């Protein structure tokens, strides 16, 4: 036997043009080959257009957005499970579209997780909600018609139940009969340990159901089942690789053995690009087990839209050769394109793991198909596509042989493949039906609706009679023509996300083992207090340096900040090491703060040139010029917290510097070493020694600086109480009234209604409340959840919080590092002890020995029971009745804070009513509440959360400056 | 002189009074007050607070 | 609508300039040039803050950022 | 001024815009800082001891006009 | 051209739909007598619709007589 | 629907009646109104057009007499 291949590690995002330079000349097919492709594909499309309806047909017919399609399909599924069809019909006629629009949308969605939530109207009701807006746009009668069509789609193309047992019973064939379709199991991303067991049992149960109804033919002519690795493990991620290999591989092996005993086709689905390498590790370790010898049905899907696709085929082939197995290997284009684009941008990667032009995916798909056909008979390829051109092209390359199959999803490609079977008798195609429980439908529908609603989609275009048949027949190479056109011209690289305004900081893809190992390796390879006299001397020295720095040209100040950003990223490992050792930060938080620090420098520099680089001409009479400028105020005191000891330290300091002020900077007592390094870096980057001084020490040293009569302002990030005493010490002076800029935390809420996806709420609640041990001013402190989904949401958040690893922040697998010091831990433990006697406990995690606090979840009777910002991993939850959203919003107003607010809801009218009502500075809708990006989410709020202006936004720098008008009577000239 | 002083309104070779709204934004610093200048483009913002709305649109 | 109210206030001030000028002279002690000038300045404040008001509070500023996400 | 003080000391107001003497602006500022509620904005214009510099290249009759206007 | 753009099967479907429209919404014949016979109601029953007579722009004297007779 | 909501409503329905030699000329004109983009029946059947769009009253679309003639 040949060698087991090494762990898969292809380059993540190679250059598109170099890939196109090879694929474009090789795509050339001969004239008679291309003519047959043209004929096959024309006949296939003519059959598609012959005219059972589909999802895309419903979307097209009623001009529905994907949100509206989703709402109607959820309503449809609920209505199908009303015991009496006549009861459902009465509902559709008499109630649907008459009113209770948001109630119907909310109840029908709650039904998917809480079957008892829904059991089945004044006139003139304002049409709101997804359904009400649909009614205003189309009329209630069309909405009824659309809902009835969605009911036919949900009943014909999905195999669903309140439990997997009911789904499998509904999808059963008659005893002695084979199932006419394979099972694409619903289920992705276990959030809890209980989730992972349930999906395992569902899969095992489905394997027995399709096994008992499998016929007597050999492979390939036997049913299949499709499974997702993320469903089988609650932290399926590269940084948790060590536990995944120990925990997931036995689970996947157990299911594969159960599949083998029925001689089934067993397929591991392909998921996001940052899980490719981990999935191949798991798949290799499973396939290696000798219990799977003698069975030809094991396999996996490979996504052609990935630049690594061809290397994955090589890896899978060497795997099959090394263990002397036959594998069934599914080639798809890829279901997560939008996710991959967004992720690479957010993560500042140096490129995209996927192609960005559709024709490039189609080109690579045919090249990969040709590669897979040549690997027969060891590899049995399965070409999963509903594109008539792709099918015609793959068929022509096979040159009329067998040993492969096509694949489709129930409700798509039926006319395509029926016609193919008519014209080529030896054609096999496998049809999968989605099978699973209601609690897994929403997550599945969201992704299915993206492909069916995409404008570039082939099935959507082949069904629009506006698109001529010849348009759907252009071969990919003819659309790309030249390799330099491989990348999409309107999609910038992540490093160009803000061009030409400024550069972007670079991130790291943790799902690329080469990138993660280098980062871990680089990082692994890496103070007397001030007397009141030395602080007093620091002010005097900054005061003397003010005049020259103030008069230094803005472009020179900006150049210094941009060089500071350059040095930060060049020395990223040093600062990351400091953030981990001194700050206690996990590697993602440390990398993220380093990026934020560089982003602050570049953004304030760009803002700085705009604001202080030139004068504004004012209109006015002739013979007179009027020019408005802004100039530095004087000496700013900057006081910074320990929880962002580099980025907030540098944001405040470089803002004051950019506006032309000299700065005395007082860092938190707990984190002076990183502040010392940053100041030394700023001096090296071009900030004169006379313009910036560091003073370390106690709160009494911070007080002496802010009481000093010669300072011109204070920029402060910390607690409400210290901000007030600073404000009082400033107002007590007899000198000028100087600006105070303060950000002082929040008691930040999130509102989740029953239309939100519970697994996304859970993800975002876990992140917002427990990332960085809750040591973020933006962190979620108070979750409001509608009662109809509160049980499932609270239980999923608790199960997810239990899977967070707490420990040493330098370990790659850690999710929750220690809290800053013993005094912090003592404050948090006191609030925990108090809440245990005062409110319901849902989760109290196990904390390791040391300066750790584990995630906690408490449920309150009323929001009023939470009266302080508690700066730790401690979530509070209130469940509420949908009619009481006003009591919720008053509860949020009552705290006096207003920093962040999360809103999880499908309902735009609900989201908007919340935004209109609250004053909160940062509102995050259907995502987590943390990690504001400089120049993207200007960060800061009002009330007890501080003064503004927002850091990282366009109103920040001006507050550090004063205005000057120069009026010159020019008439003498 | 302009480079050296911090005064809010500098009038060269004319009188010092009667600032015109939107022409000479009026106001200064030190013991003369806080800013922003009345009748100028930075005035209104000081009476307001900022709000960022971030919507994950990916579901669409 | 707030801006319209300020512009209508400016319209009314100038339309009733004689009344306010008289008030500025009798109650304020202002000479006629100072009163007229302050009346003009009052109307100018209304129209200027109204125009600034539409620019500043009339619409949202879109922030750059990743695809799949809006920031306003 | 006691009624002005009651208004600026009221715990429900969200800011103060003030034009007058330095001394009163400071006491307003102190009454704001003394509150336990939010730190609210104070916008204050408080006068000046305004100078003029005239050198020997200036036209003395234009300096005179402008000094008389600006001071009286 | 319709076939190249939509495919012959869609053209067949469109033609069958046009056949339903022509049969349901038009009262036609090779002569007016056949149209009127096809558009007749049962003896003793009123026609559920009024007649918008086809016919415009006689080009010939024979045309004008034929349209007169059709109308009559 | 009108007859359902207002019982005293009368409407007359016409059918086209005539011979084949008159169909073409009739169809050409009928097809212009059914195929026109501005047509109400064409827009009320396109679900892309929201119901509120079809309800704008004519005066609100013209606003000013100088806009009566079509600008293009
Ligand atoms: C039986 C079966 C099983 C599966 C899958 C399909 C079927 C039929 N899929 C889904 C598959 O990847 C794909 O999303 C859809 O089938 C649509 O692709 P087509 O070839 O049908 O259509 P079509 O040819 O219209 O191609 C659409 C695809 O093109 C790509 N695309 C669109 N715009 C692009 C752009 N600007 N640049 C680059 N590429 C672009 C996307 O991948 C998109 O899905 C999947 N998917 C997956 O990721 N893992 C899996 O395990 C499976 N499993
Ligand atoms: C029973 C019956 C009998 C007849 C007629 C209709 C019916 C139902 N018609 C046809 C009629 O004049 C009209 O053409 C159609 O009925 C469509 O008009 P609506 O009010 O239905 O539709 P709709 O309200 O959509 O209005 C369409 C009409 O608007 C007008 N229009 C479109 N664009 C315009 C523009 N840019 N500027 C100005 N006007 C514009 C045109 O007149 C066009 O027909 C007719 N017609 C006729 O000329 N003589 C006749 O004897 C008859 N007889
Ligand atoms: O999506 C991922 O890759 C990880 C897995 C658990 C939470 N986020
Ligand atoms: O706001 C801050 O940064 C500090 C740290 C814990 C609570 N207050
Ligand atoms: O052992 C581990 O690594 C994980 C972390 C939390 C629960 N188990
Ligand atoms: O957005 C966040 O999570 C942190 C909190 C203060 C600014 N950045
Ligand atoms: O403090 C402020 O807001 C003023 C306005 C422009 C310059 N600084
Ligand atoms: O410029 C002037 O003379 C007056 C004084 C305050 C503002 N306008
Ligand atoms: O009070 C301020 O200065 C902030 C800046 C932008 C809006 N208001
Ligand atoms: O500044 C003012 O308006 C008052 C008048 C005299 C002293 N201070």
- Secondary structure (H, E, C), C2-68: HHHHHHHHHHHHHHCHHHHHHHHHHCCCCCHHHHHHHHHHHHHHHHHHHHHHHHHHCCCCCCCCCCC
A432 lines ligand 1 (CB under 6 A): yes
Q: Give the residue among A600, A890, A852 at the shortest CA–CA distance from A751.
A: A890
Q: Give the residue among A760, A750, A853, A758 at the shortest CA–CA distance from A806.
A: A853
Distance A718 CA to ligand 6 centre (A): 12
Whether there are 3 or more C-beta pairs closer than 8 Å between C and B is yes
Across the interface, do E4 and A45 touch by the CB < 8 Å criterion? no
Q: Name the strand (E) or helix (H) holding E52.
A: strand E50-53
Query: Resolution in angstroms, to 1 decimal, for this deposition?
Result: 2.2
| Residue A523 φ/ψ, nearest 5 degrees | -65, -40
Report how far apart, in Å, the C-alpha atoms of A522 and of each of A277, A572, A726, A821, F39 are.
22, 9, 41, 27, 69
Question: Which residues of chain A make contact with B35, given a CB cutoff of 8 A?
Answer: 962-963
d(CA A252, CA A259): 11
d(CA A121, CA A91): 12
d(CA B26, CA B11): 12
Shortest alpha-carbon distance between residue B31 and chain C (Å): 24
In order, the DSSP letters of B7-58 are -SEEEESS-S--PPTTTS-B---GGGB--PPBTSTTTGGGGS---EEEEE-T
Q: Which residues contact B57 (CB under 8 A, 6 or more apart)?
A: C68, C69, C70
Question: Which residues of chain A make contact with F47, given a CB cutoff of 8 A?
Answer: 61-63, 138, 142
Is D21 among the annotated ligand-binding positions? yes
Count of CB atoms situated within 10 Å of the CB of A818 = 22
Is D46 among the annotated ligand-binding positions? yes
Q: Are A839 and A861 in contact (CB under 8 A)?
A: yes
Residue A36, classified by CB atoms within 10 Å of its CB into exposed (0-12), middle (13-18) or buried (19+), is middle
Q: Which residues contact A627 (CB under 8 A, 6 or more apart)?
A: A615, A616, A617, A618, A965, A966
Q: Name the strand (E) or helix (H) holding A969.
A: strand A961-969
Q: Nearest-5° angle of CA A144, CA A145, CA A149?
A: 115
Residue D45 falls in the annotated catalytic set: yes
d(CA A878, CA A900): 17
Rg of chain E over Cα atoms, rounded to whole angstroms, equals 17
d(CA A812, CA A848): 16
d(CA E25, CA E19): 10
A871 lines ligand 4 (CB under 6 A): yes
| Residue A341 φ/ψ, nearest 5 degrees | -60, -55
In the DSSP assignment, the letter for residue A218 is P
Report how far apart, in Å, the C-alpha atoms of A29 and of each of A35, A398, A675, A807, D55 are.
10, 13, 63, 58, 88
- Can you say how many angstroms the Cα of residue A305 is from the centroid of all Cα atoms in its chain? 20
The residue whose CA has the least distance to atom 4 of ligand 2 is: E52
Count of CB atoms situated within 10 Å of the CB of A936 = 22
Q: Are A99 and A136 in contact (CB under 8 A)?
A: no
d(CA A323, CA A143): 56
- Can you say how many angstroms the Cα of residue A440 is from the centroid of all Cα atoms in its chain? 19
Report how far apart, in Å, the C-alpha atoms of A71 and of each of A98, A105, A435, A764 are.
17, 7, 20, 22
Packing angle of the helix pair A55-62, A441-453 (nearest 10 deg): 60
Return the best residue to mutate from A233, A237, A282, A803 for the ligand 3 pocket (most ligand atoms within 8 A of CB): A237
Q: Are A117 and A107 in contact (CB under 8 A)?
A: yes
- Can you say how many angstroms the Cα of residue A435 is from the centroid of all Cα atoms in its chain? 26
In order, the DSSP letters of A555-609 are HHHHHHHHHHHHHHHHTHHHHHHHHHHTT---HHHHHHHHHHHHHHHHHHHHHHH
Whether there are 3 or more C-beta pairs closer than 8 Å between A and F is yes
Q: Name the strand (E) or helix (H) holding A89.
A: helix A85-94
d(CA A735, CA D25): 11
Helix (H, G, I), strand (E, B) or coil at A29: coil
Q: Are A651 and A600 in contact (CB under 8 A)?
A: yes
Length of chain C: 72
Indicate left, alpha or beta for A413 from its phi (over 0: left) and psi (-120 to 50: alpha): left
Q: Name the strand (E) or helix (H) holding D4.
A: helix D2-9
Shortest alpha-carbon distance between residue B25 and chain A (Å): 7
Q: Name the strand (E) or helix (H) holding A665.
A: strand A662-666
Helix (H, G, I), strand (E, B) or coil at D25: helix
Q: In what order do the strands lie in the sheet with A692-694?
A: A692-694, A662-666, A635-639, A713-717, A740-743
Q: Give the residue among A662, A740, A736, A734 at the shortest CA–CA distance from A706.
A: A740
Shortest alpha-carbon distance between residue B43 and chain C (Å): 9
Neighbouring C-alpha atoms within 13 Å toward the C-beta of A118: 27
Question: Which residues of chain B make contact with D47, given a CB cutoff of 8 A?
Answer: 32
d(CA A679, CA A696): 12
Q: Nearest-5° angle of CA F16, CA F22, CA F26?
A: 60
| Residue A566 φ/ψ, nearest 5 degrees | -55, -45
Q: What is the 3-state secondary structure (H, E, C) of A616-660?
A: EECCCCCCEEEEEEEEECCEEEEECCCCCCCHHHHHHHHHHHHCC
Choose from A39, A40, A51 for mutation: most chain E CBs within 10 A: A51
Binding site members of F for FAD = 40
In the DSSP assignment, the letter for residue A275 is G
User: Strand ranges (DSSP E) for A261-376?
Assistant: 265-268, 298-303, 327-332
Return the best residue to mutate from A805, A812, A813 for the ligand 5 pocket (most ligand atoms within 8 A of CB): A805
Distance A773 CA to ligand 5 centre (A): 16
In the DSSP assignment, the letter for residue E47 is -
Question: Which residues of chain B make contact with D48, given a CB cutoff of 8 A?
Answer: 28, 31-32
Question: Which residues of chain E make contact with F11, given a CB cutoff of 8 A?
Answer: none
What is the rounded end-to-end Cα distance, in angstroms, of chain F? Answer: 37
- Ligand lying closest to the C-alpha of residue A631: 7
Retrieve residue C14's tokens: 């100038």
Per annotation, catalytic residue among D13, D45, D47, D62 = D45
What is the rounded end-to-end Cα distance, in angstroms, of chain A? Answer: 95
What method was applied to determine this entry? X-ray
Helix (H, G, I), strand (E, B) or coil at F47: coil
- A922 - beta bridge partners? A900, B52
- C71 - beta bridge partners? B54
Rg of chain B over Cα atoms, rounded to whole angstroms, equals 18
Across the interface, do C63 and A501 touch by the CB < 8 Å criterion? no
Distance B39 CA to ligand 8 centre (A): 11
Q: How many Cβ contacts (< 8 angstroms) between chains E and F?
A: 62
Q: Are A766 and A919 in contact (CB under 8 A)?
A: no
d(CA A351, CA A508): 11
- Ligand lying closest to the C-alpha of residue A759: 3
d(CA A279, CA A513): 12
Dihedral of the alpha carbons of A315, A319, A320, A324, in degrees to the nearest 10: 150
């Amino acid at each position: 036997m040949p060698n087991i291949p090494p762990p898969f590690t292809a380059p993540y995002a190679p250059d598109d043009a170099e890939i196109a330079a090879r694929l474009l000349p090789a795509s050339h097919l001969s004239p008679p080959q291309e003519a047959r492709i043209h004929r096959t594909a024309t006949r296939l499309i003519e059959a598609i257009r012959k005219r059972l309806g589909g999802v895309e047909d419903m979307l097209r017919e009623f001009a529905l957005s994907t949100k509206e399609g989703l709402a109607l399909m959820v309503l449809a599924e609920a209505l199908l499970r009303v015991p009496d069809a006549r009861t459902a019909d009465q509902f559709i006629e008499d109630k649907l579209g008459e009113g209770d629009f948001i109630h119907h949308e909310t109840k029908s969605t709650a039904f998917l997780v809480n079957a008892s939530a829904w059991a089945l109207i004044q006139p003139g009701e304002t049409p709101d909600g997804t359904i009400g807006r649909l009614v205003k746009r189309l009329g209630a009668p069309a909405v009824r018609t659309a809902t009835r069509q969605a009911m036919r789609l949900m009943g014909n193309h999905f195999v669903l139940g309140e439990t997997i047992e009911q789904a499998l019973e509904r999808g059963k064939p008659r005893s002695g009969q084979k199932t006419r379709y394979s099972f694409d199991m619903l289920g992705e991303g276990a959030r809890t340990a209980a989730d992972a067991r349930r999906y395992f049992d569902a899969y095992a149960s489905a394997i027995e159901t399709i096994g008992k109804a499998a016929g007597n033919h050999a492979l390939p002519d036997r049913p299949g089942i499709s499974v997702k690795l993320s469903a089988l493990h609650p932290r399926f991620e590269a940084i948790s690789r060590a536990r995944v290999m120990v925990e997931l591989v036995p689970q996947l092996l157990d299911l594969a053995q159960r599949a083998k005993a029925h001689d089934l086709n067993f397929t591991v689905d392909a998921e996001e690009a940052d899980r490719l390498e981990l999935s191949l590790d798991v798949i290799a370790a499973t396939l290696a087990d000798p219990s799977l010898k003698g069975w030809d049905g094991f396999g996996l899907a490979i996504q052609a839209y990935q630049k690594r696709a061809s290397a994955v085929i090589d890896y899978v082939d060497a795997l099959a050769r090394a263990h002397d197995r036959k594998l069934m290997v599914r080639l798809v284009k890829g279901a997560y394109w939008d996710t991959e684009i967004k992720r690479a941008q957010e993560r500042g990667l140096d490129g995209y793991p996927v192609f960005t032009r559709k024709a490039m995916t189609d080109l690579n798909y045919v090249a990969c198909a040709s590669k897979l056909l040549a690997l027969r008979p060891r590899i049995f390829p399965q070409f999963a596509t509903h594109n008539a051109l792709t099918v015609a092209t793959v068929l022509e390359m096979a040159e009329g042989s067998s040993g492969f199959e096509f694949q489709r999803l129930h409700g798509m490609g039926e006319a395509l493949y029926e016609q193919l079977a008519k014209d080529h008798a030896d054609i096999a195609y496998r049809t999968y039906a989605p099978v699973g429980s209601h609690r897994d439908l929403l997550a599945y529908l969201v992704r299915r609706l993206l492909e069916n609603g995409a404008n570039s989609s082939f099935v959507a275009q082949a069904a629009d009679y506006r698109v001529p048949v010849p348009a759907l027949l252009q071969r990919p190479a003819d659309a790309i023509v030249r390799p330099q056109a491989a990348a999409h011209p309107r999609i910038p690289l992540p490093c160009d996300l803000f061009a030409p305004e400024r550069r972007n900081s670079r991130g790291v893809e943790f799902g690329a083992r080469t990138a993660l190992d280098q980062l871990l390796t680089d990082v692994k390879a890496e103070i007397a207090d001030a007397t009141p006299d030395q602080a007093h001397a620091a002010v005097a020295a900054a005061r003397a340096g003010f005049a020259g720095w103030s008069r230094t040209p803005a472009g020179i100040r900006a150049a210094a900040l941009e060089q500071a950003a350059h040095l930060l990223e060049s020395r990223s490992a040093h600062f990351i090491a400091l953030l981990q050792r001194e700050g206690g930060k996990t590697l993602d938080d440390a990398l993220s703060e380093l990026r934020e620090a560089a982003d602050f420098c570049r953004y304030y520099a760009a803002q700085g040139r705009k604001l202080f680089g030139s004068e504004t001409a004012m209109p006015g009479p002739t013979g007179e010029s009027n020019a408005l400028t802004m100039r530095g105020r004087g000496v700013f005191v900057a006081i910074s917290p320990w929880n962002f000891p580099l980025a907030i330290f540098l944001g405040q300091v470089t803002a004051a510097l950019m506006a032309g002020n000299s700065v005395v900077a007082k860092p938190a007592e707990q984190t002076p070493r990183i502040a010392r390094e940053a100041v030394a870096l700023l001096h090296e980057a071009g900030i004169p020694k006379s313009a910036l001084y560091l003073v370390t020490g106690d709160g009494r040293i911070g007080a002496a600086l802010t009481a000093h009569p010669d300072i011109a302002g204070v920029v402060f990030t910390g607690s409400t109480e210290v901000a007030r005493s600073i404000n009082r010490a400033l107002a007590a002076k007899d000198g000028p009234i100087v600006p105070l800029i303060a950000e002082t935390g929040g008691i930040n809420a999130m509102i989740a209604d029953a239309t939100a996806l519970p697994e996304q709420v859970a993800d975002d609640v876990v992140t917002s409340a427990f990332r960085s041990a809750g040591q973020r001013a933006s962190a979620l402190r108070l979750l409001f959840v509608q009662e109809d989904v509160a049980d499932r949401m609270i239980e999923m958040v608790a199960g997810a919080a239990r899977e967070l690893k707490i420990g040493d922040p330098s370990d790659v697998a850690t999710h929750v590092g220690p809290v800053i010091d013993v005094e912090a831990k003592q404050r948090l433990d006191a609030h925990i002890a108090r809440m245990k006697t005062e409110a319901r406990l849902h989760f109290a995690g196990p904390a390791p020995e040391g300066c750790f606090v584990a995630p906690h979840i408490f449920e309150l009777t009323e929001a009023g029971q939470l009266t302080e910002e508690v700066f730790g991993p401690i979530l509070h939850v209130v469940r509420y009745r949908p009619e009481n959203l006003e009591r919720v919003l008053r509860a949020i107003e009552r705290t006096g804070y207003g920093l962040t607010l999360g809103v999880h809801s499908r309902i735009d009218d609900s989201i908007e009513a919340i935004i209109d009502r609250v004053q909160v500075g940062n509102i995050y809708v259907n995502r987590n509440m943390i990690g504001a990006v400089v120049g993207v989410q200007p960060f800061g709020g009002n009330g007890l959360s501080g003064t503004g202006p927002k850091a990282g936004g366009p109103h920040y720098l001006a507050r550090f400056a004063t205005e000057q008008t120069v009026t010159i009577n020019t008439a003498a000239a």
